[PDB]
From Swiss-Prot:
GO CC terms: plasma membrane
Residues of the full protein shown: 28 to 642 of 1021
Major place of residence: membrane
Domain of life (superkingdom): Eukaryota
Posttranslational modification: N-glycosylated.
Tissues in which the protein is found: Expressed ubiquitously in leaf, apical meristem, hypocotyl and root.
Source organism (scientific name): Daucus carota (Wild carrot)
Name of the gene encoding the protein in the UniProt record: PSKR
Topology in the lipid bilayer: Single-pass type I membrane protein
Molecular function in Gene Ontology: ATP binding; protein serine kinase activity; protein serine/threonine kinase activity
Misc: The 36 amino-acid island present in the 18th leucine-rich repeat contains a ligand binding pocket that directly interacts with PSK. An island domain has also been found among the extracellular LRRs of the brassinosteroid receptor BRI1 and has been shown to be critical for its function.
A GO BP annotation: defense response
The protein, known as: Phytosulfokine receptor 1
Length: 573
């Protein structure tokens, strides 16, 4: 049997909402989202008390009534993922039985209540709201049972409070995605039970202290996207549980500390977009947990470290925007762990050698070679085989050649981007036979001849990065096959700046998911087929600069297209 004073409180709460909660019978202890425990359980009159109110993802809207603080036996309040807004009553943080507070993913704003007394609280979740001002200075002075604090994705600003050290039982502390600035207070390095520290996406600056070594339970540390500067402290011997470290996008300099090069624990390491100098060095017999390594966009000199294939767990590698001026070492022939490689804009030479070597990597799914090998010849040798390859991107390399047959040795290929090279010849009809291939970018080469009918037959675009065939800026001729209509999964078809001829097929609307359709700058005749009005998702369209004539379809999407996307045609009206 439900309690009197608790029902009054639940009423005020309902009074504050904008819509009624389904499932709320007049006995509230049987209501959905509520849990009761007897007065004598919690220890002459005995009633049900409301210990747990769980409303998550209920599509609720309104303020959060001050009266909710009148349930004193409340243990867990979970409001997550709703539309609630307004401020938080000071009293809502004075509850002495409260264990779990989850307000995350709502519209709450205002200052966050500065006095928090929740002597029983395990969990505090305000993640992703509109709160602003300071993180409460005394926040940790009253939370002796505390485990996780998540303030992330808010407007908190100023420095991280010096009082942060009084939080010594805490394990998870997310401060990420706020307006926080300044140096990290030393007190922070006194929380010794802390296994996750997320400071990412703030204005924080200054040094990263040696004192970081004091947090010896740290498994995951994200300081990325800040103003942090100077050298990365050589502390990694002591942080022996740490598997995830991202310092990406800061002002760090100097070279990587030897202990980081020696970490037994580190798994995902991301240093990208700092300015770090010297030669990349990893002791690959030490770092046996290393899986992802991102050094991209940094000041390194020297060569590509050839000892790297000795890393037995190392799967993905991003070396982009590091200027080596080097070939790929032959030792890469031995890399069995490697699944993903990006050398993009790294000054790599000898694509002939690069591909001879990289093909012996059995497990490589994805290879990004963009902005290297300037004006070199794309290898034509049929015997190169990348069996497990899924993504191949080699773009803006000014590569000379035809589309090579050795690609056919990549049967499982999903994504192929050859755009912005000097490639020529006809588009090979065998491209149509790649069954997994949903993204093809051949644009801005010199290709000639006709679009192969087999493209019309590609398995992945028929039935079950946006799916795209982009042939634009070539010398292509012939007409647009009406069987393009069989591609029901195609989002983008970009044919612009070719010389294509005849009529827009009309069967073109079987393409149910077509979003972008660009035919501009060709030589096309006839009318825009009225059936094209059937493409429900087509946001952007151009036939501009052709020989087309007739009425423009009445449409609605058609009604949206700018004047610009019909211009250049004889008869359009
Ligand atoms: C809040 O409720 C959701 C389900 O609605 C659940 O997944 C989540 O774990 C709850 N939050 C906490 C801190 O228990
Ligand atoms: C790289 O890091 C700098 C310095 O923190 C930042 O200003 C910039 O936005 C970052 N750029 C990218 C592409 O992440
Ligand atoms: C290795 O990394 C994994 C997760 O990728 C982590 O669970 C584990 O703690 C790490 N091993 C060591 C030695 O810390
Ligand atoms: C590299 O690692 C091994 C094993 O951890 C170690 O014994 C060796 O001396 C290290 N070499 C360097 C250059 O630090
Ligand atoms: C390649 O290098 C140039 C010159 O350093 C740089 O400005 C640009 O961001 C890089 N391009 C890409 C897309 O990586
Ligand atoms: C490409 O790389 C290999 C291996 O070092 C070398 O034999 C060859 O001469 C290079 N090719 C050119 C044209 O520089
Ligand atoms: C085509 O490629 C060149 C460089 O390869 C580039 O400068 C140019 O802007 C590109 N043109 C178009 C239309 O994208």
């Amino acid at each position: 049997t439900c309690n009197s004073n608790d029902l009054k409180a639940l009423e005020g709460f309902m009074r504050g909402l904008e819509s009624s909660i389904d499932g709320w019978s007049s006995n509230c202890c049987d209501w959905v989202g509520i849990s009761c425990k007897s007065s004598v359980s919690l220890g002459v009159n005995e009633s049900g008390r409301v210990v747990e109110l769980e409303l998550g993802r209920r599509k609720l809207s309104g303020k959060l009534s001050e009266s909710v603080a009148k349930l004193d036996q409340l243990k867990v309040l979970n409001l997550t993922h709703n539309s609630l807004s307004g401020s938080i009553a000071a009293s809502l943080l004075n509850l002495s039985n409260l264990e779990v507070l989850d307000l995350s993913s709502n519209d709450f704003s205002g200052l966050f209540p500065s006095l928090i007394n929740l002597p029983s609280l395990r969990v505090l979740n305000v993640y992703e709201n509109s709160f602003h001002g300071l993180i409460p200075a005394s926040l940790c002075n009253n939370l002796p049972r505390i485990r996780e604090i998540d303030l992330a994705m808010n407007y908190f600003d100023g420095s991280i409070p010096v009082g942060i050290g009084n939080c010594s039982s805490v394990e998870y502390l997310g401060l990420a995605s706020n307006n926080l600035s300044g140096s990290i207070p030393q007190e922070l390095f006194q929380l010794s039970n802390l296994s996750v520290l997320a400071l990412q996406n703030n204005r924080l600056s200054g040094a990263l202290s040696s004192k970081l070594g004091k947090l010896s339970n740290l498994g995951r540390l994200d300081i990325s996207s800040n103003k942090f500067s100077g050298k990365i402290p050589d502390v990694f011997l002591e942080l022996n549980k740490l598997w995830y470290f991202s310092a990406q996008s800061n002002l760090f300099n100097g070279e990587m500390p030897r202990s980081l090069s020696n970490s037994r624990s580190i798994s995902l390491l991301s240093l990208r977009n700092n300015t770090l100098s010297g030669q990349i060095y990893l002791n690959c017999s030490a770092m046996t947990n290393l899986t992802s390594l991102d050094l991209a966009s940094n000041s390194f000199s020297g060569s590509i470290p050839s000892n790297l294939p000795n890393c037995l767990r190392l799967k993905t590698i991003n070396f982009a925007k590091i200027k080596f001026i080097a070939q790929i070492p032959e030792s890469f022939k031995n890399f069995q762990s490697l699944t993903s490689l990006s050398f993009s804009n790294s000054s790599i030479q000898n694509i002939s050698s690069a591909l001879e070597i990289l093909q012996h990597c059995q497990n490589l799914k994805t290879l990004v070679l963009t902005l290297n090998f300037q004006k070199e010849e794309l290898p034509s040798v049929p015997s190169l085989q990348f069996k497990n390859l899924k993504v191949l991107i080699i773009a803006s390399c000014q590569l000379r050649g035809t589309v090579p047959q050795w690609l056919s040795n990549s049967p499982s290929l999903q994504l192929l981007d050859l755009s912005w090279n000097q490639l020529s010849g006809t588009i090979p009809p065998w491209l149509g036979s790649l069954n997994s291939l949903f993204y093809l970018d051949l644009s801005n080469n010199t290709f000639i001849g006709e679009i192969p009918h087999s493209l019309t037959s590609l398995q992945s675009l028929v039935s079950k990065f946006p799916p795209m065939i982009d042939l634009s800026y070539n010398s292509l001729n012939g007409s647009i096959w009406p069987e393009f209509g069989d591609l029901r999964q195609l989002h983008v078809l970009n044919l612009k700046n070719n010389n294509l001829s005849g009529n827009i097929p009309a069967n073109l609307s079987g393409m149910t998911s077509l979003e972008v359709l660009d035919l501009s700058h060709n030589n096309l005749s006839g009318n825009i087929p009225p059936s094209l009005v059937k493409l429900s998702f087509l946001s952007t369209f151009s036939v501009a600069y052709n020989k087309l004539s007739g009425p423009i379809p009445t449409g609605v999407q058609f009604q949206t297209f700018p004047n610009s996307s019909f211009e250049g045609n004889q008869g359009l009206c």
